[PDB]
Amino acid sequence: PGEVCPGMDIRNNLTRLHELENCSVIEGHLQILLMFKTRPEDFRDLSFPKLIMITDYLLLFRVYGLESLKDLFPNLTVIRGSRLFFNYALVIFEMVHLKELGLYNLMNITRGSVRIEKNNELCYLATIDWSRILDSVEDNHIVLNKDDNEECGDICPNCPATVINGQFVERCWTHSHCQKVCPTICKSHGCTAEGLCCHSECLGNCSQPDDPTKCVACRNFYLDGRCVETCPPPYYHFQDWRCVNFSFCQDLHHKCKNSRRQGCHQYVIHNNKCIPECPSGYTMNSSNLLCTPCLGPCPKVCHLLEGEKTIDSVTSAQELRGCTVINGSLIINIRGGNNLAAELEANLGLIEEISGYLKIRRSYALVSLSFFRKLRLIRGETLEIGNYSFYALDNQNLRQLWDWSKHNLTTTQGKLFFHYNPKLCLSEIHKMEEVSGTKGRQERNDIALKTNGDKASCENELLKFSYIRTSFDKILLRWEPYWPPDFRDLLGFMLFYKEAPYQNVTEFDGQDACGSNSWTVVDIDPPLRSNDPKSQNHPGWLMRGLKPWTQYAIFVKTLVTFSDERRTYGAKSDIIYVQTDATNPSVPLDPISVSNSSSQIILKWKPPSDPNGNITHYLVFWERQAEDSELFELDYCLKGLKLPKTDSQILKELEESSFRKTFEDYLHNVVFVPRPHRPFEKVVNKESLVISGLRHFTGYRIELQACNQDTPEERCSVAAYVSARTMPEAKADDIVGPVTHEIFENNVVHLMWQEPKEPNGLIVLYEVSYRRYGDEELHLCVSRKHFALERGCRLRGLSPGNYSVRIRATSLAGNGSWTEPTYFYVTD
C-alpha cells in the first residue's frame, strides 16, 4: 500500500488535506471540522482513493457543502476503534447539503457505535443494515434526520436483500452501489465477488481466495506483507495492529525523549508489547528499556515543564499530584483562597526529593514548611545565579522551617538566602546548620542579622505548671506567674488546647491558613502584683467544655509589647499532656431481639455512644411479663384481634496599653525632683447473647447494662429496656380426648371438652362445626365466657339425626387441628 502517518486535526482551511498524498493506514484519529466558506464546487477534484484502514475514529462536524462522501473516502474497509469519541466510532453531526452517505465499502467496524444526527438533507439511511456491519448493534443513535418525514424516493438497483424487523426491504448504499453481503457459512472473513469465502484471517475484501498474503485488512496483525495471528520472536506487538522488531521500538523513545511540546509517549518493553507506560507497581530499568516490578514506594516519575513550575493556588498544584521525585527547580507563591487547612498537605504530602533550587518568593499564606513531610534532600544539581540553592523573601508570617528532632534534612552544595523574613527567628536558622551541615564544607553564607526577628521572640524562659486537678468534666490550670522586668508591658496570656490521640503532637502544625486554626485559642487576663513572694498572685483559668476519658495537649504562651530598641521578652511552657477521669457510661443503643425456637431469644444491640473508659463487660437481666389480664374481657369473634480577634484589633488594643503606660511614666517624671428476684447474665467482649430455658410465647422484658470497671466496687449506667417474644409450639393447641356429647330432649345439646393443658398465651375462641353429611354447614363461635360459665357449649337449633362435628380452639397463635367427627347418633 502506502506508508503509515499520524492523525490529522484540520480546521477552517482546505490546504491541510495535501498531507494525505501518500497515506494508506492513518493510525490516530482523523477529524474534519468547522469549515464554513467552502462551496460545493471546491469538493469535486478532491479524492483519497487509497485510504484503507483507519484505527481510532472518524468525525465530520459542521462541514458545509460536502455533497457526498463517495468521492473523498471511496475505499474505507475497516475502522478499528481503540480510542473513541463519547464512545462513538463514527460521528456524522450537523452537515448540510449531504445527500447520500455513500461509504459503500466499509465491512467491519470493530468496536463502538455509529452516531448520525441532524443533517437535514440525508436519506439512504433506512436501507443500511447495521446488523452485519458493527457487532454491537444496540447503542447507535440515528434521530432527527431528513427521514422522519419520508419524502425522497430512495430507489436503488439486481441487489440482494435481507430482513431486519419483519420488513423485507432491499439493501443499498447509494443509487448506484448496493451493500455487499456474504452468506453466513463464512461469517466475518468476507466473501469474494461470486461467493466463495476468503482466508481464515482476513477482514472484508480479499483479492484472491485462500491466499493470506494478499487480502487488504488483516484482522489480528500485519507482518511484512504477510498476515499472522501472533507475531513470533524476535518481533514485538505495537499499537495492536502491526509488528516491529526491537530496533524499531527503541530509537523513537530517544527521538522524542525531548518534547517539541508533548510528549512523547516514552516507550517501554513489557511482555511482547510496546506500551506507553507500565502499570502500577512496575518501573522501567533504563538500560535495555525492560519493565520490572517494585519493592516499597515506587517512583512515578514526575518530570516538569521547562525547569521551573510556579504554584499560585491549589489549581496550579494539581499538575504535581502524587509526584515523588522532581528533576528541576521549584517555586512556591501562595496568597490565599478558601479552606486552606489540610489541602496544601494533601497535594504534596508524599513528595520525596527535589533537585533544583527552592524559592519561597512572595508567599504570605503559609506559616511553616512542614508540608514537605517526606522530603529528605535538596541536592541541587542545577544552581541559582548568585551560587544559591535556597531563597526566601517576602515571608511576613512564616514562623518555623522544620522540626529537627523528628526529621533529618541534608544538602550538599550551593548557598542560602534568608532576607526580609520578620517572623522567622534567628536561632531557628542557627538550628538548621547542625542538621544540614553547612558548618561542614564550611562556607560564608549571607544572612543579615537585623532583617529577621521583628515581631518575634527567641529568648523566652520556661514556664512550669504548678497544680493540676481533674474531675469527670473539668480541669483547673494554675501555673507560676511570669513577669517581664517591666511589669506594665505584659498584656495577658494565651492558652492553646486540642484533643490528642497519642503522645506525639508537635507545637505548630496543621493550621497553616490565614484566619483559621486547628487549636482552640482562649484568653485570660493577667493577675495583680503586690510585691509579695507569698500572696494571691498565681494566675489561673478554668476549662469547662471537656469530654470523659480523653487525653489533651496544653501549653501557655505570653503576649507582650516592645520597648523601643527591638528587645523583646516572653515565655513558653512545655507541652504537657493531661487526661481526664471516668464517669458511668450511657445506655446501650437500639437493642433488637429476634427468636428462632420455642425457648430461645437472641439479642443484638450497639456499643454506647460515649463509653467513658475501657468497657469490661455487659450485664443483662430478663424478667417475665405474664399476660395482659384486661385482654380477658373481649369477645374476639366480633371485629378481629386487639393486638474573632483580627489583626487590626491586635494593634489598636496594643496601642491603648502603650498609651496608658506613657502618661503615668510622664507623671512620675515631673513630680519628683532630686536635690542638688430475676436472674442475670454477664457477657464479656461481645454484642450478642443466646438466652435459653424459657417458657413458650410469653413476653419477656430485658434490661441492659454496660459496665466498664468491675473489681473495685463496680459502677455502671441506666438500663436500656427492650421486650421480646418466643415463637410458639404448634402441637400444644389441640383438644385432648374425644368431645363428650350429652343429649337433652328439647333439642339443645351439651358438647363439652377439656382445654389443652399448656396453651400458648391464651385460648380465646372456639370454632365448633356440626354438619349433616350431605347438608350445609353453619359455623358457631363459642366465646371464652360461655365456656367458662357452662363448661361446654349448649348448641340450640339442632334437627335430629347423625352429625359429623369438628371441634377446634383458636388461640393467639393460629389453628390447631380438628378433632374426630363427633357422632351422636339416633337410629331413624
Binding site: 517591666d486 506594665r488 502584683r529 510585691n531 512620675h668 519628683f672 525632683v673 536635690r675
Partner: peptide
C-alpha cells in the same frame, strides 16, 4: 526585685522617706 519602676515606685519610695517628706525646688 530591685528594678523599681511602674506603680511600685510610688509605694517603695514612701517607706524609705516616711517622715522627712519629699523634695521640690
Amino acid at each position: 526585685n530591685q528594678h523599681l519602676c511602674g506603680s511600685h515606685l510610688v509605694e517603695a519610695l514612701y517607706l524609705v522617706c516616711g517622715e522627712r517628706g519629699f523634695f521640690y525646688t
